[PDB]
Design a binder for this molecule. Structure first.
Ligand SMILES: CCCCCCCCCCCCCCCCCC(=O)OC[C@H](COP(=O)([O-])OCC(O)COP(=O)([O-])OC[C@@H](COC(=O)CCCCCCCCCCCCCCCCC)OC(=O)CCCCCCCCCCCCCCCCC)OC(=O)CCCCCCCCCCCCCCCCC
Ligand SMILES: CCCCCCCCCCCCCCCCCC(=O)OC[C@H](COP(=O)([O-])OCC(O)COP(=O)([O-])OC[C@@H](COC(=O)CCCCCCCCCCCCCCCCC)OC(=O)CCCCCCCCCCCCCCCCC)OC(=O)CCCCCCCCCCCCCCCCC
Ligand code: HEA
Ligand code: HEA
Ligand SMILES: CCCCCCCCCCCCCCCCCC(=O)OC[C@H](COP(=O)(O)OC[C@H](N)C(=O)O)OC(=O)CCCCCCCCCCCCCCCCC
Ligand SMILES: CCCCCCCCCCCCCCCCCC(=O)OC[C@H](COP(=O)([O-])OCC[N+](C)(C)C)OC(=O)CCCCCCCCCCCCCCCCC
Ligand SMILES: CCCCCCCCCCCCCCCCCC(=O)OC[C@H](COP(=O)([O-])OCC[N+](C)(C)C)OC(=O)CCCCCCCCCCCCCCCCC
Ligand SMILES: CCCCCCCCCCCCCCCCCC(=O)OC[C@H](COP(=O)([O-])OCC[N+](C)(C)C)OC(=O)CCCCCCCCCCCCCCCCC
Ligand SMILES: CCCCCCCCCCCCCCCCCC(=O)OC[C@H](COP(=O)([O-])OCC[N+](C)(C)C)OC(=O)CCCCCCCCCCCCCCCCC
Ligand SMILES: [Cu+2]
Lengths: 211, 53, 50, 50, 674, 50, 318
């Protein structure tokens, strides 16, 4: 039972640093009782339907299009947990508290929503987990997610990458004729100095240096 | 959500009895609002649906 | 699709469904004629190929 | 070196992969001046008509 | 009087520590040690979200590999691709759909719908939930794990010399025989307590007779004499040489693979073909999954038979259709779990004891293994699909505020489908050479499973008509489920055509069939059930905007991802190949695009959960306490309360005249005035 | 229109091109990994929003 | 990874002094109103703390900015302390860079690709920052009080029209030059923590992103965002306590809370505000740190890359 004293720092009316949630205009979950037993919606008239009797009043016509503005009724704010009180309500005394269910219905365990930042993880779970399975674990391998760079001129060996030979294969007689056939696309690089420079239309990045 | 309607009738005993048409759910107690306020919101979330077994 | 999407929402002539129980007996037999025709066609074509 | 944070630049050895044409490869025509020119042209024409 | 305590910050810190300890105890007693079925179901749902993300990541790996030919993802690692495919299939069947449905929905709704205080075995419920994670981990990480854990550039020759103990076998001779030991010490030392690595390079330096090729990390024994780790650091990634070629072998252990989620023999049941490792992991994990399923269906079926409410002991027509479907699937799992367990136990015995259960040379037959697995197999898929029928049969009448078309006939249709599930197991074995009598029996009993499903379709369609429709978010998911189930059902019926199945067995046509059935229809029904019980699951109203985004991206993504798979199946694309003819790359790319659309939908679903828990608004049922308008007086009461509620909502919003005035006079930017 | 197509629409287009020029397509298929362009387009829209 | 450093070209003492002074002046001019808002936010909760709940915890930087602009001075009213903040910032940077360059040149490794470890560089930077913050404590004290006198009653305002004016007023009213170093220890701690909480995380995430994604261009900026976040987390409590000690008037009557030192300030912050009170103005401080670091790193990278290209370093050495 009971409650602590008054502190103006906790009062939104006095402490202007407390930002007001306009979606909680008429709802104060800290005053909620469990189970909820307070009526907050009853008959409302004189909004568009007058509360008086003009059914057979030939001098009065009802125009609901002229509905006067009223205070907006926000959707009901869910209850917020009172941690300590909750941790004092569901607390168990070992070997001195009987294993029984009380007669009062207030012993029911009600679910009151808590902090929100935890669900931020739930917001980013499909991203982070995927990163955890592709970036942190580097699956399938290290070089898949890296930006693609071709190997340099004749690296790591002329067997895997016979670029120089390919150059000759495109500068020899036969190679030229092959390009004339149109079944072989033109050469996609040039050997300048000891470096291989890809043409702009090739569509690849330049090879990295041998640092 | 407690009672959708109220009614006053007279039985064969001449008594002015009260009948409260409750709010129902379609086969799902999960979809039933187990509340004790004259409202329409589902404010109460009971962890133990059958508290006293 | 037309009847449900154009005349079955709350604002467009809904129906007061006063029906305690389903009372269908041979509706399954009548409706399963179309699957029966499909089975006949599949069996005939498959056997003729086989 | 200059302030609290040092943007350490690290040299790295060569790496390469099997394929080269399905990742991030900056286009040659995508320069600052060219992008600004084309975007400004399209934007001013569309804005004038709008 | 005035109190000047020197430790006020310290009083605050003491209160913080007390709060943290009390909160730890509260969390342990409420979410870890609890037997509460609702909390256990919520934990099941979150664990299932994690496992569904794992399965989606595995499917993403598969689709990235299949995006275009040439093995762009695994780079020729066919064994790794097969392991990934098997893990995806197994954890999607046994650790996403089954956990979601049974764990979450059963443990949440059976106490509700049947009307029982918790379950018959709360201990068994907790046990099943907390034994799920080990099987999930074992079945989901076989794509990352194999006994050949080292990569092709890992110089095993740097550390494996430290493994060979046959090098010191000579000294083992004289440990119990000192007689000649002194003579053994008079020999010539060649490689005694020393390691020599042969030249790995051609060095032309005649000044040096011998060149030391000791690994660079093994030179200073001091640094290694106090390090409590194996010598693998000297062999793990110590060379820059790489071979970025598809044809090079990155495993050198061709046997280290798996045989798909359908264990095919003798491939599964022989170390000669599937080496020790992932295959054994899968077999024993299936044993464990069978044990967990046994616990689950025991706990759930004893509850309804014993702890049911007095009026719903035997009248299954009164329970919600999801509960009817769950109980039917639990009985089906009760029947098939012993068969599956026997099959996998026989596979394990054949692998590690050479019992030759499936070796034809001396009596065995792999066809027996196929028969056992598929006897379990098809009833498993019918277990997976049926509860979604319950989800739609609950959601559609709720929003339409009318009775379902024929609940009795739908129940008998799903029950006869369950009956036929035990005589159609052979339609997966048309080509294995079964006798024509059995093959015809399987075909004729399979084609007649279209009879019960069409009853379900007709009943859903007739439930959609002649009622007061209240469009919600679960309803749209129900429509998506119906649309997806229309396609997969008729394609599967086509798969019972014998000649077509001959031309479509083990094909992406079958893949698209059971993915439109499972990935599309079953997961869409699961999502619809989640939205339908969102308040019951979380206590707050869900987020319409991100929910609609998830609905749009997830539902269409299934079509975009699995219609091209139909087109590929008609083109002759065999399953379980990471490389294919280049005439399939367009539709494979379209399928991967659809999969990424589905991933965006999943992102939107997690975002909608996050935004709903930001919102923190109490949910109001659309029925307003009158689910059924059995009487015109009930209709009048609902209409009055609905008008009052709408009037209450429309406060703070200006009237029609004011809004029209503002809209008409919005524009205020003029040049010349009077 | 000149002011808004030079500094707003043109800036949007220039930032989008500067951020999304290098995402190459697939030769005979479709750009399956379009999710890589979502954080990039979000950054482009945020940068040119004000 | 210690082989991977790239120190082929190292700027001279004059070069580092000039570049640091110029680029840091530009950054401080760009991002001073953010620090004005941050100091303003830390003062309006000097004894109240965070009293809102859930997503509303903290003080809205946009709300503070709107109020300060509605004061009537406009954007020009955010640089009152910038008149004195710039001199203090530049003096701190000059002293810190001199000490850092001297200690580094007396201890740097011989090989151009070998650099001191993050721990050694953190020790050097912490010593340099502590020394410079102790030497620039009067300037930082004058700067903070100029910002502080906007959210305080007319009786509590010091009324400093500049930097030398503030120095003279403090040396006269509060006893002497010894009163110029109020909060000097707090400033020293703030500089020490700030000098060690950025390079570490920045290099961490930059190298890990490179390993994951190769030599892309967003790697350094994402790492800078991460480093700014972690530096703000590590430094904000010390900066908050420094602001509290700077804004504490000599007269005990003109103080919402009276502190006898850094420990007393921390104790009272924990007692009245709580643990969450140290991170008031986190968004403003983090945005300021990120923008300052981005401007400085970008301009320094451009200038130093141009100088390396002029000097003749190979493109992989730049
Ligand atoms: C715990 C020991 C370890 C257990 C096993 C853990 C195994 C590893 C998994 C990761 C850790 C668990 C993550 C959460 C799983 C779902 C649990 C659940 O259903 O909680 C319901 C509980 C209901 O609270 P609510 O809806 O806010 O309203 C009630 C109030 O909280 C008021 O109710 P209350 O009075 O009970 O409030 C107490 C408590 C509420 O209690 C909890 O939050 C319970 C936390 C422990 C759950 C233990 C069972 C987990 C079962 C497995 C499920 C996940 C499988 C993961 C598989 C591997 C993935 C890698 O809330 C707090 O103390 C606030 C902060 C809690 C910490 C952050 C959230 C966790 O919390 C949620 O629904 C939040 C879900 C958030 C999901 C993502 C969390 C990521 C956290 C990472 C950093 C952690 C530091
Ligand atoms: C989900 C389930 C949980 C586990 C997830 C991770 C699982 C994998 C894993 O553990 O990987 C290892 C991984 C570490 O390996 P790594 O990431 O590869 O790093 C490689 C090396 O360690 C080398 O890494 P490193 O040492 O370079 O990285 C540290 C670096 C980079 O670190 C970061 O970027 C993040 C940390 C920032 C530190 C600075 C801010 C500190 C703020 C407060 C503390 C938070 O930070 C620094 O160098 C610190 C510089 C700043 C010093 C600040 C001085 C003042 C301190 C006091 C301030 C007081 C303020 C209020 C008054 O993560 C961990 O070990 C952390 C999780 C461990 C979980 C298991 C053990 C639990 C024990 C309980
Ligand atoms: C939950 C999953 C699920 C469901 C419900 C089904 C349902 C059906 N399945 Fe199948 N199936 C699988 C999951 C499922 N299946 C899996 C996973 C495999 C492969 C296992 C593996 O090998 O890996 C498989 C394999 C499989 C094969 C083997 C293909 C091959 O390998 O050769 C065959 C063929 O007989 C088949 C048939 C059927 C039939 C006839 C139905 C019927 O029950 C469906 C009938 C339903 C309808 C008929 C309703 C549709 C209604 C209509 C009115 C359609 C008409 C509409 C239009 C034409 C617009 N299935
Ligand atoms: C129900 C099971 C299930 C599900 C959902 C899926 C989903 C998907 N499947 Fe698969 N699949 C199988 C069962 C499933 N699959 C089986 C049994 C096999 C055969 C194994 C074999 O061939 O041996 C198979 C094989 C298979 C292959 C074969 C590869 C090959 O043979 O070449 C491919 C490749 O295209 C593929 C693709 C996909 C894709 C792109 C999805 C996408 O739909 C993925 C979308 C992601 C989700 C659907 C997860 C939902 C996310 C959540 C986090 C849910 C959790 C949240 C809650 C609801 C609480 N699947
Ligand atoms: C992961 C690393 C932690 C990241 C954030 C932790 C705290 C989240 C937000 C938060 O501040 O919670 C709040 C509390 C601690 O703050 P406080 O100062 O007591 O606020 C009440 C204040 N006195 C007031 O006036 O309102 O926080 C708590 O209640 C306990 C914090 C424990 C979190 C991790 C511990 C394990
Ligand atoms: C220890 C605690 C946890 C640590 C977790 C660490 C990771 C956290 C999660 C990731 C954060 C975001 C990082 C984005 C960086 C993007 C940079 C970039 O250009 O990337 C290019 C890459 C690759 O683009 P690509 O398609 O051109 O390259 C394919 C590979 N080659 C080059 C061979 C053709 O794209 C992405 O990474 C897209 C990221 C989108 C946003 C999602 C982030 C997670 C991504 C996981 C893998 C991809 C799954 C896609 C579907 C996801 C659905 C959920
Ligand atoms: C992101 C910006 C995108 C801009 C795209 C469009 C660009 C082209 C159009 C630009 C129009 C605006 C600039 C006009 C410049 C010329 C006028 C001028 O400078 O006059 C002298 C102005 C006059 O200011 P003034 O306020 O005295 O104006 C005089 C009129 N009264 C007094 C009545 C209000 O002087 C200054 O601005 C002095 C300060 C220098 C600039 C400071 C910039 C600060 C930027 C924000 C920093 C962060 C703040 C906190 C944010 C929230 C917390 C994190
Ligand atoms: C005045 C002098 C102040 C000195 C303060 C301590 C040294 C500097 C801060 C610590 C530091 O730089 O850590 C980076 C170092 C970096 O370690 P590293 O230099 O070995 O590099 C790690 C990264 N690799 C190996 C990949 C290159 O990280 C840590 O020390 C990790 C623990 C966190 C920091 C612990 C000390 C914090 C400061 C306490 C002050 C009291
Ligand atoms: C450690 C103490 C608990 C965590 C920080 C609590 C806190 O002050 O949060 C509010 C502060 C609020 O910062 P703020 O002062 O910028 O507030 C602005 C917040 N809005 C505009 C949303 C109202 O949040 C943080 O400090 C977030 C980073 C925390 C880093 C440490 C964990
Ligand atoms: Cu089957």
């Amino acid at each position: 039972h009971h409650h602590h004293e008054y502190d103006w720092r906790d009062d939104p009316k006095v402490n202007k640093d407390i930002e007001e949630d306009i979606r909680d205009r008429g709802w104060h979950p800290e005053t909620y009782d469990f189970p909820y037993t307070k009526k907050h919606d009853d008959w409302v008239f004189d909004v568009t339907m007058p509360s008086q009797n003009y059914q057979t009043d030939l001098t009065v016509n009802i125009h609901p299009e002229n509905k006067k503005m009223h205070v907006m009724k926000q959707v009901m704010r869910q209850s917020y947990w009172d941690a300590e009180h909750d941790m004092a309500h569901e607390y168990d005394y070992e070997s001195e508290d009987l294993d029984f269910q009380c007669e009062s219905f207030k012993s029911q365990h009600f679910r009151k929503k808590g902090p929100i930042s935890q669900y931020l993880i739930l917001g980013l779970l499909p991203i982070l987990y995927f990163g955890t399975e592709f970036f942190y674990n580097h699956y399938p391998d290290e070089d898949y997610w890296r930006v693609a760079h071709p190997p340099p001129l004749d690296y790591p060996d002329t067997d895997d990458t016979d670029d120089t030979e390919t150059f000759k294969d495109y500068k020899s007689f036969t190679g030229r004729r092959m390009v004339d056939t149109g079944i072989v696309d033109p050469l996609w690089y040039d050997i300048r100095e000891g470096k291989k420079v890809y043409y702009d239309w090739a569509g690849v990045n330049q090879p990295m240096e041998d640092i | 959500q407690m009672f959708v309607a109220r009614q006053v009738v007279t039985n064969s005993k001449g008594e002015k009895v009260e009948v409260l048409w409750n709010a129902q759910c379609y086969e799902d107690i999960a979809q039933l609002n187990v509340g004790f306020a004259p409202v329409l919101e589902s404010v109460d979330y009971h962890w133990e649906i059958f508290l006293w077994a | 699709i037309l009847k449900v999407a154009r005349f079955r929402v709350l604002k467009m002539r809904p129906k007061i469904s006063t029906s305690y129980r389903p009372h269908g007996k041979w509706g399954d037999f009548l409706a399963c004629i179309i699957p029966l025709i499909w089975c006949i066609n599949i069996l005939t074509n498959s056997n003729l190929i086989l | 070196m200059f302030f609290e944070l040092e943007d350490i630049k690290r040299r790295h050895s060569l790496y390469w992969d099997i394929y080269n044409v399905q990742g991030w490869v900056r286009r040659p025509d995508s320069t600052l001046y060219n992008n600004v020119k084309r975007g400004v042209t399209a934007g001013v024409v569309a804005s004038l008509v709008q | 009087v005035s109190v000047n305590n020197y430790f006020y910050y310290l009083d605050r810190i003491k209160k913080l520590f007390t709060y943290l300890n009390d909160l730890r105890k509260h969390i342990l007693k409420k979410y870890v040690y609890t037997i509460n079925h609702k909390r256990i179901a919520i934990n099941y749902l979150y664990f299932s979200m994690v496992t569904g993300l794992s399965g989606a990541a595995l499917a993403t790996m598969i689709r990235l590999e299949l995006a275009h030919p040439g093995s762009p993802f695994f780079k020729g690692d066919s064994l790794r691709y097969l392991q990934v495919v098997t893990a995806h299939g197994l954890i999607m069947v046994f650790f996403v759909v089954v956990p979601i449905l049974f764990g979450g929905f059963a443990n949440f709704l059976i106490p509700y719908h049947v009307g029982s205080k918790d379950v018959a075995y709360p201990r068994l419920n907790s046990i099943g939930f907390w034994i799920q994670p080990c099987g999930y981990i074992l079945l989901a990480k076989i794509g990352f794990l194999r006994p050949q854990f080292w990569r092709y550039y890992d110089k095993t020759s740097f550390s494996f010399p430290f493994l060979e103990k046959m090098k010191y076998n000579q000294y083992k001779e004289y440990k119990n025989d000192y007689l000649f030991y002194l003579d053994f010490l008079k020999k010539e030392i060649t490689d005694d307590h020393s390691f020599f690595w042969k030249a790995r390079k051609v060095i032309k330096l005649p000044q040096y007779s011998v060149f030391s090729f000791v690994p660079l990390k093994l030179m200073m024994w001091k640094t290694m004499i106090n390090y409590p780790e194996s010598f693998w650091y000297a062999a793990s990634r110590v060379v820059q040489s790489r071979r970025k070629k598809v044809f090079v072998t990155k495993c050198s252990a061709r046997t280290l693979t798996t045989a798909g989620w359908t264990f095919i023999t003798p491939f599964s049941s022989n170390i000669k073909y599937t080496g020790v490792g992932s295959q054994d992991i899968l077999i024993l994990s299936v044993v464990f999954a069978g044990i967990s399923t046994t616990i689950s269906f025991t706990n759930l079926l004893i509850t309804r038979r014993t702890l049911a409410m007095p009026g719903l002991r035997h009248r299954r027509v009164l329970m919600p259709f999801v509960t009817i479907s769950i109980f039917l699937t639990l009985r089906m799992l009760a029947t098939i779990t012993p068969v599956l367990g026997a099959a996998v136990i026989m596979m394990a015995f054949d692998r590690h004891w050479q019992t030759t259960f499936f070796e034809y040379a001396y009596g065995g037959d792999p066809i027996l293994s196929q028969h056992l697995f598929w006897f379990f197999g098809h009833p498993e898929v019918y277990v997976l699909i049926i509860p979604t029928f319950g989800f739609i049969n609950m959601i559609v009448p709720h929003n339409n505020t009318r009775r379902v078309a024929s609940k009795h006939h739908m129940i008998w249709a799903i029950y006869v489908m369950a009956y036929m599930g035990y005589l159609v197991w052979g339609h997966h074995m048309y080509l294995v050479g079964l006798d024509h009598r059995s093959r015809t029996m399987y075909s004729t009993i399979t084609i007649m499973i279209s009879m019960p499903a069409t009853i379900k379709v007709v009943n859903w369609t007739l439930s959609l008509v002649n009622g007061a429709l209240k469009i919600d978010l679960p309803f749209l998911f129900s429509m998506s489920f119906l649309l997806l189930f229309l396609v997969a059902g008729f394609t599967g019926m086509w798969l019972s055509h014998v000649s077509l199945n001959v031309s479509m067995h083990d094909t992406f046509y079958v893949v698209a069939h059971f993915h439109i059935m499972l990935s599309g229809a079953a997961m869409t029904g699961i999502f619809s059930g989640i939205y339908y019980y969102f308040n019951a699951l979380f206590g707050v109203k869900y987020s319409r905007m991100f929910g609609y985004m998830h609905l749009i991206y997830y539902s269409g993504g299934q079509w975009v991802a699995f219609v091209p798979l139909f087109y590929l199946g008609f083109s002759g694309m065999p399953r379980r190949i990471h490389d294919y003819p280049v005439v399939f790359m367009g539709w494979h790319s379209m399928s991967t695009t659809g999969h990424f659309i589905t991933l965006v939908g999943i992102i939107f679903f997690f975002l909608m959960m996050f935004d709903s828990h930001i919102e923190r608004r109490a949910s109001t049922s659309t029925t307003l306490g009158l689910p059924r308008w059995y009487k015109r007086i009930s209709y009048y009461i609902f209409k009055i309360r609905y008008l009052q509620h709408t009037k209450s909502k429309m406060n703070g919003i200006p009237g029609s005249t004011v809004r029209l005035m503002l809209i008409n006079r919005h524009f205020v930017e003029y040049e010349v005035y009077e | 229109a000149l002011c808004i197509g030079t500094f707003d629409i043109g800036a949007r287009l220039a930032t989008f091109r500067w951020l999304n020029n290098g995402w190459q397509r697939v030769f005979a298929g479709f750009e399956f990994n379009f999710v890589r362009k979502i954080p990039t387009t979000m950054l482009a829209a945020l940068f040119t929003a004000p | 990874m210690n082989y991977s450093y790239k120190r082929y070209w190292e700027p001279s003492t004059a070069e580092v002094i000039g570049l640091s002074l110029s680029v840091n002046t530009i950054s401080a001019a760009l991002t001073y109103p953010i620090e004005f808002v941050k100091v303003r936010s830390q003062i309006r909760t000097e004894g109240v703390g965070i009293r809102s709940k859930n997503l509303y915890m903290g003080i809205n930087p946009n709300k503070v900015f709107r109020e300060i602009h509605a004061t009537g001075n406009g954007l020009r009213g955010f640089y009152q302390g910038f008149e004195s903040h710039l001199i203090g910032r530049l003096s701190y940077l000059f002293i810190r860079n001199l000490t850092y360059k001297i200690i580094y040149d007396r201890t740097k490794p011989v090989k151009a690709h070998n650099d001191l470890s993050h721990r050694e560089k953190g020790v050097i930077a912490g010593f340099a920052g502590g020394l410079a913050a102790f030497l620039t404590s009067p300037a930082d004290l004058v700067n903070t009080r100029t910002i502080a006198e906007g959210g305080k009653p007319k009786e509590w305002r010091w009324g400093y029209k500049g930097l030398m004016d503030g120095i003279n007023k403090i040396a006269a009213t509060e006893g002497g030059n010894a009163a110029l170093f109020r909060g000097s220890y707090a400033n020293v701690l703030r500089a020490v923590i700030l000098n060690i909480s950025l390079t570490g995380p920045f290099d961490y995430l930059n190298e890990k992103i490179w390993i994951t994604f190769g030599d892309m261009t967003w790697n350094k900026y994402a790492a800078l965002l991460w480093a700014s976040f972690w530096g703000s987390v590590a430094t904000l409590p010390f900066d908050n306590i420094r602001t509290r000690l700077y804004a504490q008037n000599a007269d005990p009557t003109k103080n919402r809370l009276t502190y006898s030192g850094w420990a007393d300030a921390a104790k009272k912050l924990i007692q009245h505000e709580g643990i969450s009170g140290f991170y008031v103005g986190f968004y403003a401080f983090y945005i300021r740190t990120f923008l300052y670091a981005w401007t400085t790193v970008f301009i320094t990278d451009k200038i130093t890359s141009d100088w390396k290209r002029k000097a003749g370093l190979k493109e992989w050495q730049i």
